[PDB]
Amino acid sequence: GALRRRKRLLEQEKSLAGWALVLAGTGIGLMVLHAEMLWFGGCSWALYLFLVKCTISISTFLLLCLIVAFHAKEVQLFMTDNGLRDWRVALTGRQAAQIVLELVVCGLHPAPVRPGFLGQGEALLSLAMLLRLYLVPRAVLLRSGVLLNASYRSIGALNQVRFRHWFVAKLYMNTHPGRLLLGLTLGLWLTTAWVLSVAERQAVNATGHLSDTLWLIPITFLTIGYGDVVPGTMWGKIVCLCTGVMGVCCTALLVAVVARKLEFNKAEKHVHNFMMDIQYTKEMKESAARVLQEAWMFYKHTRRKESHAARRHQRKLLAAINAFRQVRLKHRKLREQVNSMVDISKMHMILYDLQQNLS
């Protein structure tokens, strides 16, 4: 069968999804290093600002080679899946425009074409490196086991899940909420703080670097907004709006996660229901005794004909029988819920019993 070859191509796509992510991250890191070296170093280090700037070009040429090699594996996977024999049939028209839109976005490095400011030109090309962050959901989806098993693709084709990026989002968020939601916001704070420090530099008095924006970004993200530092430039305000929008969205995500993580499941409901069952019977006995004591002591102080020291015990008798009726009617509706939990499966078994009992 060809199902051994189809699975074989999905380890050649997993590696080409991982190593492309490595060669994109090592371009972003060298971009950050160049942008900070040109600020802290000036025009004296004009050799290293050529060396790193061409190392970025070598890395992005290797990245542009590790995407054509990926889409070739996808078109071979398409030919293997639907049973074709010519690649010219297997390629689409909109897909071949996605190839060009992917190669252009993965090729916007600041090249070595030619005091510490980047300039109006290359500061946008340097921040266009961050648009490589679409390579991470592809790699996460391929490293997960849902796409990488035809036994999983069978149940997916029975369900029309169709290998969404949103299903693994729901998966990793229902399985590991706190690791994902803790790493994501710290990554957003560091990335957005650095981009804001690029947008606001202020060589006079050093009033725009990470010592200010690492304080301005979480205060915007959590929607505190003291206002001791505010963004000054038109490009800083766009970044400080896109930080607040993500802060509202992450708070709205955290509310739903914490709302799911408070309810009981089946098994914790059972032990809660047992801890209450051993506890209401104690008060069912205690308040019964509290009825029965005053029930005799009021008749005793009545037969002793002391009408002043009997009204107090009649008052406590009324309070005790009120408390006893409260705890009894509270006790029976718990056991009603105990009977309510085992309704469906017991009827499903009793139906199979009474079916065989008819013969």
Partner: protein, 66 residues
């Protein structure tokens, strides 16, 4: 309130026969409830002891209490 008194006795009716032992009838007020006096419990046994056979049919005892 006599129905509430009988239903309070019916908690300690582990036999379902309408009779309760004097051991349990002393232990209910003695070990639980609000409090317990020894002379009041012995006087309660002296008052309920029209029979004194170690078991009390509480249905007549409710009527004697009310």
């Amino acid at each position: 309130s006599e129905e509430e008194i009988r239903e309070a006795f019916r908690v300690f009716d582990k036999d379902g026969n309408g009779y309760i032992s004097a051991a349990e009838l002393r232990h209910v007020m003695t070990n639980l409830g609000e409090k317990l006096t020894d002379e009041e419990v012995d006087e309660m046994i002296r008052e309920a002891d029209i029979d004194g056979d170690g078991q009390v049919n509480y249905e007549e005892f409710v009527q004697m209490m009310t």
